[PDB]
Amino acid sequence: VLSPADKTNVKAAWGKVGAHAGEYGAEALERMFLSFPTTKTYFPHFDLSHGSAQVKGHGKKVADALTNAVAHVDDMPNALSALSDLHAHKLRVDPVNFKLLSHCLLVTLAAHLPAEFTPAVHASLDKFLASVSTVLTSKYR
Amino acid sequence: VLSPADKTNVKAAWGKVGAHAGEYGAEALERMFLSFPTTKTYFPHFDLSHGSAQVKGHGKKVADALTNAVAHVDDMPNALSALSDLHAHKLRVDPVNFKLLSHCLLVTLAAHLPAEFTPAVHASLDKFLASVSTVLTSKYR
Amino acid sequence: HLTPEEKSAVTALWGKVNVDEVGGEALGRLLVVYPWTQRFFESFGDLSTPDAVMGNPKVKAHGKKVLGAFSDGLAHLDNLKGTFATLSELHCDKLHVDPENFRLLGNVLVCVLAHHFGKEFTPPVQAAYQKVVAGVANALAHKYH
Amino acid sequence: HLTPEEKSAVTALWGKVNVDEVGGEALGRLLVVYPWTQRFFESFGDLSTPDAVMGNPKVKAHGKKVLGAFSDGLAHLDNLKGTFATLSELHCDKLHVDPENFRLLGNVLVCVLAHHFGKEFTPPVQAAYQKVVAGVANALAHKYH
Ligand code: MH0
Ligand code: MH0
Ligand code: MH0
Ligand code: MH0
Ligand SMILES: Cc1cc(C)cc(C(=O)N(C)[C@@H](Cc2ccc(-c3ccccc3)cc2)C(=O)N[C@H](Cc2c[nH]c3ccccc23)C(=O)O)c1
Structure with missing residues (x-):
């Protein structure tokens, strides 16, 4: 569960990201594809080369989803x-x-x-991302 | 989330355990210590040999905790x-x-x-044990 | 690494397995217990319910094929990587199957073996099989890139 | 395994690392981000707040020891298992440390390197270090039984 302090930390950190959210999203995806190749099995239809249009576009969607969660941190589900x-x-x-x-x-x-x-x-962001992940997998079964 | 069907399924399967609680709890622990040796790092104070008094006793405690969870499946937290x-x-x-x-x-x-x-x-029991595990780790940080 | 005695336990129990049946049962339970795995078999038809999944002829046939390859691999426990090298590249380049799926099926298989053999599937025998399914899963994910 | 280009990347970046400092930073962050890891340091004193942990002299001292051994391992990337054999046995038999802790520390270390080096910690460099921390964790876990 996110504490008042966690929320303050997440909002402060993500606020600093600001306009670069989309860029960071694309960069995080690229880091994922290179460090953990198995994740590429979900994007066989993507050009996964550095700076590809598809990765850039997807990074933007992912980052915007996170920005939305921060804006609604008390109602993420x-x-x-x-x-x-x-x-x-x-x-x-x-x-x-x-x-x-x-x-x-x-x-x-x-x-x-x-x-x-x-x-x-660092601790708050890790809890936040885990919370988002939990919400995203809560209806799997 | 556990559905009415999952709860019905769990109560029926666990009800069959009955007097075999301590025995199955102990067997589960033994299976864990043998298949996943790293779990033994949490029981250095235990004699982990086959049929030890400590494993038997702990097995009963785990089983009873689960029996209680099953009875309070509506509000396990x-x-x-x-x-x-x-x-x-x-x-x-x-x-x-x-x-x-x-x-x-x-x-x-x-x-x-x-x-x-x-x-x-099988599916309901897996969701159940996952739910119990989630509650047991819900306050870690 | 399967002590000489663990290899014997594995081979001894597997010699009693009806691979066709256990395969269909294992793949079926995988699809029931972890529904998201159904993502690779949309063309198999009805998977709307547990019974639909278990009784689905395409599920049973695929389970038989999958466990058949698994079975042949049990004869070469010393070179699982080599044995499944080709299937590994296949699941990665053509099928695009996240290797985690191999681990999930491995666990389901252990549950199915337990359900079928009862008390015969002792804690030591389980331990030996956990090493086998982890080895097969690792082998199948080895050629991913 | 690491490619010749990855080994060079690892070695190059590490040459700019202040091992004592990064060690205190990494161990401390581990105890802050994953609080349950504090279970092995009940003799270290106050660990009740982030600053209490990060500034704890015993935590900083231990961090030096830990990353010091990690650093030596980087000089033997072709034999991590042999390099960490005695430490593996010690962590299992005497300290009773769940190997998952080594994995958690590896991830924290990657975060710390990224924090310190910024843009220099490129996606490819991170990929190289992920293989390194994974290899070290596996080596430390190798002698558990
Ligand atoms: C390794 C796989 C994987 C992980 C992990 C994953 C984790 C997450 N996701 Fe999500 N996601 C993954 C694989 C996909 C795919 C394959 C697609 C489809 C992309 C495409 O363009 O075809 C997708 N995700 C699509 C999406 C979309 C776009 C949906 C739409 O177009 O309406 C968003 C916003 C998204 N996700 C967010 C997130 C967030 C937030 C996380 C967690 C932080
Ligand atoms: C691999 C480690 C591990 C796992 C996983 C774990 C999973 C679970 N546990 Fe729990 N538990 C673990 C390690 C312990 C220890 C070390 C002890 C203390 C043993 C002793 O007597 O010294 C403990 N658990 C103690 C307990 C006790 C007894 C507490 C008391 O004496 O008041 C219970 C009832 C219990 N757990 C239940 C459970 C349940 C239920 C699950 C999950 C289904
Ligand atoms: C949930 C996903 C999934 C899991 C788990 C899985 C686990 C395994 N598999 Fe494998 N496999 C999966 C999804 C597939 C698909 C989607 C196909 C193609 C089916 C079709 O009808 O076209 C496939 N596997 C096809 C195959 C084939 C046929 C390949 C060919 O045509 O040459 C074999 C022999 C096979 N696998 C073996 C195995 C083995 C061995 C394991 C592990 C023990
Ligand atoms: C969160 C748990 C934990 C993690 C993670 C951990 C990760 C690592 N370690 Fe190691 N280690 C842990 C808990 C300890 C303890 C409890 C001690 C003994 C401390 C004391 O003296 O009270 C210890 N480690 C002691 C050590 C020592 C001292 C040996 C001795 O006292 O004879 C070294 C060199 C060491 N480790 C290395 C490493 C390395 C290398 C890693 C991974 C890169
Ligand atoms: C007895 C055993 C167990 C396992 C799991 C793996 C191997 C094994 O020989 N590997 C699978 C090696 C292989 C390897 C080879 C090449 C690359 C590579 C990548 C890019 C470019 C060029 C080459 C990656 C891995 C491996 O690196 N690790 C294993 C063992 C292992 C890894 N994770 C584990 C988790 C649990 C138990 C074992 C393991 C090892 O080398 O020993 C051997």
Whole structure:
């Protein structure tokens, strides 16, 4: 569960990301595809080369979904309901993969937030991404 | 989430266990220690040899906790509150291990309930044990 | 790594297995217990219910084929990577199957073996099979890139 | 395995790492982000807040020891299992440390390297280090029984 402090930390960190959210989304995906090749099995229809249009576009969608969750941090199950249905009933990405993307998002944020990525913020962001992942896999079965 | 069907399935399968609680709990633990040696790192104070008094006693405690969970399947978070506090603040068993014991519990039930362990019941029991594991780790951070 | 005695336990129990039946049962339970795995078999027809899935002829046939390859691999426990190299590249380049699926089927198989053999599927025998299914899963994911 | 280009990338980046500092930072973050890992340090004193953990002199001292051994391992990437054999036995038999902790520390270390190096910690460099931390964790877990 996210504490008041967790929410303050997440909003502060994601706010700093600001306009770069889309760029970071694309970068996190790229880090994921390179570090954990098995995740590429879900994007056989994508050009996964560096800077591809599809990865850029998808990174934007992923980041915008996260921005929306932060804006509705006290009502994520509902704010992400549509996305949850999509992953549970159509995409069906195995649950194990969410931790991989979450880790890569954390690494991306760490690489871009020298000042705000403190141990406390690191902890809050990890809980947040795990919470988002949990919501996205809550309707799988 | 556990559906009415899952709850009905679990209550029927676990009801067949009855007096075999301690025995199955102990067998599940033994299966876990043998198949996943890393789990033994949490019981250095236990004699883990076949049929030890400590494993038998612990097996009964685990089984009874599950019996209680089954009876309070409508509100497990509350029924398992004390247990959740225990694992989160004292025992601090890494979350990855709960799936190992859950898997060994399923195997134990499968080896003892030829008639009850149907595909549908198998699915319900897995969701159930996953739910219990989730409650037990809900307060870790 | 399967002590000489673990290899014997595996081979001894497997020699009693009806691979066709256990395969269909295993793939079926995979699809029932972890419904998202149904993502690769939309062309198999009716999978709307547990019984629909278990009784689905295409599910049974595929389970038989999958476990058949698995079975042949049990004769070469010392070189699982080599034995499944071709299927590994296949599931990665053509089928695009997340290897986690191999691990899930492995667990379901263990449950099915337990359900079928009862007490005969002892804790030690289980331990030996856990090493086998992990080895087969690792072998199948080895050529992924 | 790491490609010759990945080994060079690993070695090159590590040459700029202050091992003592990164060690204290990595171990400390582990205890803050995954609080249950504090279970092995009940003699270290105050670990009640992020700053209490990060600034704890015993935590910083232990971090030096840990990353010091990690650093030596990077000089023997072709024999991680042999390099960590004695430490593996010690962590299993004497310290009773669940190997999952080594995996968690590896991830934290990757985050710390990214935090310190910024853009220099490119996706390809991270991929190389993921193989490294995974290899080290597997080596430390190798002698468990
Ligand atoms: C490794 C796989 C994988 C993981 C993990 C995953 C994790 C997440 N996802 Fe989600 N997602 C994955 C695989 C997909 C696919 C394959 C698609 C389809 C893309 C396409 O263009 O065809 C997808 N996700 C599509 C989406 C979409 C777009 C839906 C739409 O177009 O309406 C969004 C917003 C999304 N996800 C968000 C997220 C978020 C948030 C996370 C977690 C932080
Ligand atoms: C691999 C480790 C591990 C896992 C996984 C784990 C999973 C579970 N547990 Fe729980 N548990 C683990 C390790 C312990 C320890 C080490 C102890 C203390 C043993 C002793 O007597 O010293 C413990 N668990 C103690 C307990 C106790 C006794 C508490 C008391 O004495 O008041 C119960 C009832 C219990 N658990 C239930 C469960 C249940 C239910 C599950 C999940 C289905
Ligand atoms: C849930 C996914 C899934 C799992 C798990 C899975 C697990 C395994 N598999 Fe394999 N496999 C999966 C999905 C497929 C598909 C989608 C196909 C194509 C089916 C079709 O009708 O076209 C396939 N597998 C096809 C096959 C074939 C036929 C390949 C060919 O035409 O040459 C074999 C022999 C096979 N597998 C073996 C195995 C083995 C061995 C395992 C592991 C023990
Ligand atoms: C969160 C748990 C934990 C993690 C993760 C961990 C990860 C690692 N470790 Fe290691 N280690 C852990 C818990 C300990 C303890 C409890 C001790 C003993 C501390 C004391 O003196 O009280 C220890 N580690 C002790 C050590 C020592 C000292 C040996 C001795 O006292 O004789 C070294 C060199 C060491 N480790 C290396 C490593 C390496 C290398 C890694 C991984 C890169
Ligand atoms: C007895 C055993 C068990 C396992 C799991 C793996 C192997 C094995 O020989 N591997 C599968 C090696 C293989 C390897 C080879 C090449 C690449 C590669 C990649 C890119 C370019 C060029 C080459 C990657 C891995 C491996 O790296 N690790 C294993 C063991 C292992 C890994 N994760 C585990 C989790 C649990 C238990 C074992 C393992 C090992 O080398 O020993 C051997």
